[PDB]
Amino acid sequence: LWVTVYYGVPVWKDAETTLFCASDKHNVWATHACVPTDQEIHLENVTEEFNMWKNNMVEQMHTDIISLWDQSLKPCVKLTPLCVTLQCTNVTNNITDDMRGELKNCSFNMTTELRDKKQKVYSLFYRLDVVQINNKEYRLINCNTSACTQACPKVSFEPIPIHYCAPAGFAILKCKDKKFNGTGPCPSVSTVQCTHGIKPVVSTQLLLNGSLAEEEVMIRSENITNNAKNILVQFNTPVQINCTRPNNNTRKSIRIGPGQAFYATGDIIGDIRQAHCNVSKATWNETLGKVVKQLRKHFGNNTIIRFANSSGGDLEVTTHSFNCGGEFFYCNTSGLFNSTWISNDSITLPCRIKQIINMWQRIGQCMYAPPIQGVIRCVSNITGLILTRDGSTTETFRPGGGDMRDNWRSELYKYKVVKIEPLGVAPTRCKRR
Amino acid sequence: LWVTVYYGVPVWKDAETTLFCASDKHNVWATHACVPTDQEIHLENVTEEFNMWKNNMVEQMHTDIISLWDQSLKPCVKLTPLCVTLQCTNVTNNITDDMRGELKNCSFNMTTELRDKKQKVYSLFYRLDVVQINNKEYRLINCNTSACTQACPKVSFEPIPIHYCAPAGFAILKCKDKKFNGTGPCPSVSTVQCTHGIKPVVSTQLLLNGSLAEEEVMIRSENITNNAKNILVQFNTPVQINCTRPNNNTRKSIRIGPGQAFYATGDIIGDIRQAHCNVSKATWNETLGKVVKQLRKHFGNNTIIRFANSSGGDLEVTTHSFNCGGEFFYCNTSGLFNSTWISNDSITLPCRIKQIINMWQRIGQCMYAPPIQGVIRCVSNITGLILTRDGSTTETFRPGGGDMRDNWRSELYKYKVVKIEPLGVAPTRCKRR
Amino acid sequence: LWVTVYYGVPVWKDAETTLFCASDKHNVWATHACVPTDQEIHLENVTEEFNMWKNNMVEQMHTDIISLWDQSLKPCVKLTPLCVTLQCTNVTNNITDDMRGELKNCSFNMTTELRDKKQKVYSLFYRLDVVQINNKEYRLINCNTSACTQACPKVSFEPIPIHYCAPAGFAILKCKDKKFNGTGPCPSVSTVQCTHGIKPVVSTQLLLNGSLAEEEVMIRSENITNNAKNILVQFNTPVQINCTRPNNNTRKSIRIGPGQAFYATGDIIGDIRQAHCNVSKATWNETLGKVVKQLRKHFGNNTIIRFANSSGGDLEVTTHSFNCGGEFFYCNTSGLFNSTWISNDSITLPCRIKQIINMWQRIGQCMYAPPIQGVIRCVSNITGLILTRDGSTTETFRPGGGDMRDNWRSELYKYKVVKIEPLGVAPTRCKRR
Amino acid sequence: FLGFLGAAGSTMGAASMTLTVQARNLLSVWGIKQLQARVLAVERYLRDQQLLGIWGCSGKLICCTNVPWNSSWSNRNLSEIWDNMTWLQWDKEISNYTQIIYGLLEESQNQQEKNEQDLLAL
Amino acid sequence: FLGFLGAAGSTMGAASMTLTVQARNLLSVWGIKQLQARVLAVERYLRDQQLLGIWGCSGKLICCTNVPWNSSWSNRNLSEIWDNMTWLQWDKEISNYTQIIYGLLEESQNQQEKNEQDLLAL
Amino acid sequence: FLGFLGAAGSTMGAASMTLTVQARNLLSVWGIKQLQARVLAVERYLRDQQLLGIWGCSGKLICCTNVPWNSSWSNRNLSEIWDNMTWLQWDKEISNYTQIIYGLLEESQNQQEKNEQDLLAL
Ligand SMILES: *[C@@H]1O[C@H](CO)[C@@H](O[C@@H]2O[C@H](CO)[C@@H](O[C@@H]3O[C@H](CO)[C@@H](O)[C@H](O)[C@@H]3O)[C@H](O)[C@H]2NC(C)=O)[C@H](O)[C@H]1NC(C)=O
Ligand SMILES: *[C@@H]1O[C@H](CO)[C@@H](O[C@@H]2O[C@H](CO)[C@@H](O[C@@H]3O[C@H](CO)[C@@H](O)[C@H](O)[C@@H]3O)[C@H](O)[C@H]2NC(C)=O)[C@H](O)[C@H]1NC(C)=O
Ligand SMILES: *[C@@H]1O[C@H](CO)[C@@H](O[C@@H]2O[C@H](CO)[C@@H](O[C@@H]3O[C@H](CO)[C@@H](O)[C@H](O)[C@@H]3O)[C@H](O)[C@H]2NC(C)=O)[C@H](O)[C@H]1NC(C)=O
Ligand SMILES: *[C@@H]1O[C@H](CO)[C@@H](O[C@@H]2O[C@H](CO)[C@@H](O)[C@H](O)[C@H]2NC(C)=O)[C@H](O)[C@H]1NC(C)=O
Ligand SMILES: *[C@@H]1O[C@H](CO)[C@@H](O[C@@H]2O[C@H](CO)[C@@H](O)[C@H](O)[C@H]2NC(C)=O)[C@H](O)[C@H]1NC(C)=O
Ligand SMILES: *[C@@H]1O[C@H](CO)[C@@H](O[C@@H]2O[C@H](CO)[C@@H](O)[C@H](O)[C@H]2NC(C)=O)[C@H](O)[C@H]1NC(C)=O
Ligand SMILES: *[C@@H]1O[C@H](CO)[C@@H](O[C@@H]2O[C@H](CO)[C@@H](O)[C@H](O)[C@H]2NC(C)=O)[C@H](O)[C@H]1NC(C)=O
Ligand SMILES: *[C@@H]1O[C@H](CO)[C@@H](O)[C@H](O)[C@H]1NC(C)=O
Ligand SMILES: *[C@@H]1O[C@H](CO)[C@@H](O)[C@H](O)[C@H]1NC(C)=O
Ligand SMILES: *[C@@H]1O[C@H](CO)[C@@H](O)[C@H](O)[C@H]1NC(C)=O
Ligand SMILES: *[C@@H]1O[C@H](CO)[C@@H](O)[C@H](O)[C@H]1NC(C)=O
Ligand SMILES: *[C@@H]1O[C@H](CO)[C@@H](O)[C@H](O)[C@H]1NC(C)=O
Ligand SMILES: *[C@@H]1O[C@H](CO)[C@@H](O)[C@H](O)[C@H]1NC(C)=O
Ligand SMILES: *[C@@H]1O[C@H](CO)[C@@H](O)[C@H](O)[C@H]1NC(C)=O
Ligand SMILES: *[C@@H]1O[C@H](CO)[C@@H](O)[C@H](O)[C@H]1NC(C)=O
Ligand SMILES: *[C@@H]1O[C@H](CO)[C@@H](O)[C@H](O)[C@H]1NC(C)=O
Ligand SMILES: *[C@@H]1O[C@H](CO)[C@@H](O)[C@H](O)[C@H]1NC(C)=O
Ligand SMILES: *[C@@H]1O[C@H](CO)[C@@H](O)[C@H](O)[C@H]1NC(C)=O
């Protein structure tokens, strides 16, 4: 037997590489720079060890989404002239009881196109955006932390599906097992040209517009016994949630400099009503019953499963923070998680709108979302949960979030990047002449 | 016969690729960053199809010249403080009737290096740069749209020749036919490593400082029958045009901040006269006679060729806008195109000067051209025209332009980029043992 | 004999190429972005010609150190609001006669977060930073030239070693001769993947924290006979110099905008004393005796070696300017070079501190060094000199510097980049069948 | 010496004299524009070398294969191909038959790779 | 036809049928990141081809060599290697003996380079 | 083992036994600097491999050629070239004639590429 060199053998090993975008009005997650898409080969007899909690595609996607975000906020208006004293009154014109003292009618002096001239303008500011300084005198929430850019009116925040494709010499292994818990050997592996359309949907406490499980609700945690680890629930059947902003906001353009315009809420045409989201009470209840059923396999059949609302912290982590229609909702999901489980109607979630947005947990970078003209309606899919377990025969689960890598860990759990090692040596009766 | 593989065959396909620089005080087109130059191979029996109207060399050069233009304007003073209220009077000191009301004496409060100190300065502004607010109050035209980046006085606007060189694996084919209409087969093809020195001369209605036709005037249109297409006339002998600004301007530096300085016209030393361009009446008349004679070939011998002036629109398209000496001229050119053709003296074209320049038709990015000290004289070559025909027995040709790709389409018409396909398979009697 | 082609021969030519980092809280020289380090191959019978005065490793390192310096100053506060009128009084509280008139107490009107609100603040400014306008009115020296970018307090100025590593196909030859004058053949050549840790210590008139000569003091000049060339002296044993700023500074943060903060000296707690550096009188005298002994070899045994202080010019060239502790010192060093040589005590050098720093001799790009809270003490090694000779039987040597390329020429003198030529053809009796 | 692409109008027999002239000319934000053109040239060159390698033609400008010339691709005789046509005319005629020829060359080499591999063990 | 990495679960005897399939796919915010991935693909490919040329296996997918198989590396017989195991299983077995085999192949060809140089001198 | 460039001072005969050493180290703001240096290393490596391919020397470190030695390039015999001189000394002597030999090697291979091509047609 003599050493024989084979080039092109089907051998790989785990590797980390820079996957490049591909995608099938400008967008924040630019598809113009992403190369156009085109694919899947089944690998019989191949058992591959996956780990969604040590996957580098999630970490590489987090950097890319953030980088795609702030490079789209570079060319457009920096609202440093908006840090002034605001003479804010209360909007009491046709307000409901729920949304009372939530919008402020703030008047301020604005810079004009002409440097020497001054401009006396007014705008409607949400209570969450202005802080009182001691009509009363206010200022914007983030004026002692940073000056911060108006969200560019022509770029879109809508999630567009993006395909992360491995370069030459690398392959993406896709786990086709339908009951995969994110870690361990996957008996059904296939290699894809690159991943499916993964929408970068920003959300908290609820995975919106994601991918549904094939057979049953999938419970996925790094260590199910560790309460400090978040639990990623995935639904086999979506629960649609209907978002709305009933107010008929009017967008008003204020010329704050040469070539710079600031878009302000003029006046609401009609009555002032609170934003809210609707989840079907029957659909949510049956889904939690399915969640509890698969949640008893890790804690026992006799354990008491209790759902409670968020423990506390920032508004971004205590609320179902999301975006659709251009306005950023912060909905109160205490009605979704309030139940104890033992062995036509709708749920209305009162939401709050915010315009100064800091969303990647970075202090010093705010974005001012301009008002959206008209009424905003929104229909999404609750395709999962991010739960947290409290530290007895009763287990309490509270919605989690904040860390945005968990939102994309639920889409890249079945994918794996490997490096092809095509140089192999094996014995043979060959002998070079 | 057996298949045999040849590598290195002289076969090419038409392809689009990124060509790089070559060039034999800084300039706007940064040829210092562009590589140095050095090569003429004639291709006998080669007949290649050229198309100047679908040549990607033109579209790449448009992007490159634009990108080089706005790259030299990044390290330059942004004239944001110049958007103030201007109290302007009419310069009536030694004015001629033609220049009555064109120059305005504008005083304004300007910023200083010290933030808390103001500065009452004055400057002579052209009527085309200031717009009146309703001595009377004015403001610069570039103030409800953008802020002008002042052109750096050290970077030059003089067009120096640049060579666009194909990378490895690509070739540039050069049509050496002297009667090429820019389309169809070219009996005389040659390959170059890259092109002749193509000066990015920026002008409208008249191709200045270009390349001359070898034997006869060449009329090149995408299709003559379509009046919506521009007509690129090329002269076999040049018509020289003498440009001048008789005013003796004084450049006055105004310090508007720490670092940043603003260069303003202070006072004109002596008599004030209108800028103009001179074209010899005899030389222009014979050239238009040659233009008509090769223009009757597409419209019949009995047709009446009439030359009228520009229809209407912006000052950039209705006037022969050009730049030499650092000032941007806008010449009427209505005595040039005024004649009807049936089967020592000079023409003086009154020119107007602007200092706020929107050059590449973009809106929202302007430039302030600082005043040029002294008297500007300029001698150029009219090496072509950009005519437009309008929809009887007579045809009216008016000067066109605006789209600046036509200016460099007149220099890149004979050039073509191909991709070398060196792998070829052919049959032979040879067999592999 | 027949030509035989050898690939991989050990042949190199002298070449210039781009070397990259290697490095074993952020720093100005961004070694985090630089790759990690790891390798010593001795080349017997190899005699290579080295030239430290035409070594492109020096010119590349100068560009990189400058480029890394102004790269860490991009995400830092631009002190444009600091150009205001300063009403300055003299700090006379517990002042000493040496420090009489050096520190000034300047009050000024400053911005706040809110654009419409001012801020009456004060700061202790050194006499070298403020210039008087004709309590009395002053303004910062960096205001008719540019605006200073305040040094970010988290980015450190401490020089950490960096390794310049040659790319593939290139080698770095290291001259291991211990008596190398920086020019001519080196009998002991070795190749490295890249160099030792070269700290970019920026200093003038004295090479601090450098590399020591192995056996004797080395005098390396481009040519000794030319007085216009600097003389690079290298010590075999270090002379330690103890730097101190006895003042107990207070860093007072002044919020000058949304985000942006300006750190100012508030009040010094206790007695005011002059900054100084201490060099041992015996250790310096013995070192100058060694410097003279190897300096007589180029000027004769009977010559008189006289050491005088700096001739004149900027404070950066006339003083031993350096930086340690975050403050930039400018020490007189006139007691160091004051002696004539014929064939427990310390030397205290009074130092002056600036906060507005023009570091790379560039004009129009300054930096404000924020005050360091507390008392700064600093111990470093004098490992060389930068002397200049002036055009009798006596020679006068004055300290030189300014050009920072001489500082890193004393570290890259033994290194050389060569380009490997692996293709060689030689005759052999062998013939191709 | 005709130069780069000088034999483009020559007959394919005469144009095959100078394959090395074209072969050596295939290899050698503004910096990125030049830099991406260099990488494109390298990987375009390497894909053609890889094709020659898998046909058993690596390191050869003219390579003889074991694939017979199917008359469907071109029925023209040997004389009116190497003395009457140019390489540009020829490439346009077998353009649609190029990919099926490439597969045959790849299949003929791996058959030879194993037939030599099997015989070498005897 | 199985596709790229299709024979990953196949036996090495069957997976050696499709070396060309894997060989041809080793060569071919969204700017320099995508450009440096192309350069890394070229560099990895060129270093594997350099290794083959050093061992005398340039331009070949199956290269029978002169280095004997040390039984310490793997005591298995050919029947249970080429018909019972896959290439991924095999790579795990001899992962640590890979570098000592690579040096053996490198020095063996270097001896043939001088052996054929001396024979040609006669 | 001497290491990279270790045999630089060795004689030409002794330094030609370590060609695999130098061969394998020819291949392996501030991001383009690293990236453009990597692209230049690949381009240079491919240009030297291309030269070997057109001389018939592809995949070989010592390549026997058919070009005779003119002795106008170097009158020294083998004894004083392969046992006294080093490769650095030798390179400085035939540097003038390097491009003359490089053209003869290319010309000889092209003639040989066809004399073998015409031989298979019988
Ligand atoms: C989850 O996905 C759904 C649909 O896949 C998203 O709803 C859609 O959101 C887009 C963007 O806001 C809507 O487009 C807009 O429509 C309005 C009215 O036609 C138009 O004025 C706008 O210019 C824009 O075209 C789209 O209509 C809407 N589709 C629905 C509600 O059925 C939803 O936003 C996603 N949720 C996320 C990303 O959190
Ligand atoms: C067409 O080309 C001609 C020459 O080929 C251009 O004329 C030249 O323009 C340059 C730039 O303005 C002149 O250089 C300047 O000369 C003055 C003389 O006082 C000097 O003070 C400046 O510092 C600068 O060096 C050059 O003299 C001039 N030559 C002639 C003969 O007039 C013309 O501008 C071009 N027309 C275009 C580009 O539209
Ligand atoms: C020459 O090198 C010496 C040491 O090799 C340098 O002295 C060191 O300088 C650093 C930076 O200032 C000191 O670190 C600082 O220490 C203080 C101690 O209170 C701490 O508060 C700071 O946060 C920082 O960590 C270090 O202590 C100091 N070491 C000694 C022995 O003095 C010296 O600065 C260099 N001289 C140059 C570069 O000119
Ligand atoms: C906008 O500017 C106006 C005028 O500068 C402010 O009105 C004055 O405010 C000052 C405050 O010190 C009073 O003393 C004056 O009596 C006010 N009126 C006039 C005519 O000057 C107004 O308060 C500013 N608004 C905001 C929101 O800052
Ligand atoms: C520059 O600013 C000054 C004031 O800062 C202007 O002077 C004022 O002019 C108005 C007339 O519109 C008077 O009512 C004020 O009393 C003036 N203030 C003074 C003199 O302190 C001056 O007009 C400005 N100059 C320009 C050219 O706009
Ligand atoms: C363009 O031509 C006109 C007329 O031919 C020139 O105007 C003459 O200029 C000279 C010198 O300044 C005067 O002496 C004449 O009196 C002018 N004549 C008229 C009718 O105005 C003008 O200078 C020329 N401009 C150029 C060559 O740039
Ligand atoms: C800060 O600004 C105030 C005013 O805004 C300055 O106070 C003025 O001082 C001048 C003397 O030059 C007096 O004539 C004015 O009456 C003052 N105005 C007031 C008190 O409102 C003050 O001097 C400035 N401080 C500094 C340090 O520049
Ligand atoms: C607005 O209403 C809220 C709640 O009723 C109250 O706290 C606040 O003081 C009010 N502000 C004004 C300006 O009326
Ligand atoms: C996931 O599945 C693997 C294999 O069955 C198992 O080892 C692991 O413990 C599971 N993880 C959790 C959190 O249950
Ligand atoms: C959310 O709603 C629940 C029930 O209506 C309530 O207990 C809770 O206070 C609400 N959240 C906040 C932040 O007020
Ligand atoms: C100043 O010139 C303008 C035209 O630029 C004219 O409208 C205005 O009447 C003039 N004013 C005078 C002559 O006083
Ligand atoms: C240009 O000339 C060629 C050559 O005769 C011809 O085929 C083509 O139609 C002409 N194009 C136009 C627009 O006349
Ligand atoms: C303050 O110090 C300066 C020198 O910095 C001096 O010229 C001035 O006279 C001093 N003023 C006093 C002592 O009142
Ligand atoms: C440095 O020493 C070398 C070795 O003798 C010599 O050739 C060269 O001239 C010296 N250079 C100077 C400047 O003395
Ligand atoms: C062009 O064709 C003629 C006639 O066939 C031929 O003699 C000549 O060599 C050809 N030119 C080239 C460059 O091959
Ligand atoms: C998987 O293994 C079985 C076991 O014999 C075999 O029959 C089958 O061909 C294998 N599949 C592939 C794709 O090699
Ligand atoms: C085979 O490998 C063993 C270690 O695994 C080693 O000791 C032995 O020398 C090797 N045999 C040969 C012939 O190289
Ligand atoms: C240096 O030369 C000596 C004498 O010729 C020789 O023995 C030794 O091997 C050489 N060193 C190297 C590294 O070639």
Numbering used by the authors:
A (entry chain E), B (entry chain C), C (entry chain A): 34 to 57, 65 to 78, 82 to 138, 147 to 185, 188 to 309, 312 to 323, 323A, 324 to 397, ...
D (entry chain D), E (entry chain F), F (entry chain B): 519 to 546, 570 to 663
Task: Recite the paper's sentences.
Broadly neutralizing antibodies (bNAbs) targeting the HIV-1 envelope protein (Env) inform vaccine design, hold potential for therapy and prevention, and advance efforts toward achieving a functional cure. On the HIV-1 Env trimer, bNAbs recognize highly conserved epitopes essential for viral entry. One such epitope is a V3 glycan site located at the base of the V3 loop.
Fab was added in a greater than 3-fold molar excess to SOSIP trimer, and Fab-Env complexes were then isolated by size-exclusion chromatography (SEC). Structural analysis revealed four trimer classes with either 0, 1, 2, or 3 bound Fabs, with the most populated class being a 3.0 Å single Fab-bound trimer. Structural analysis of the 007 Fab in complex with a SOSIP Env trimer revealed sub-stoichiometric Fab binding, a surprising finding for a potent bNAb.
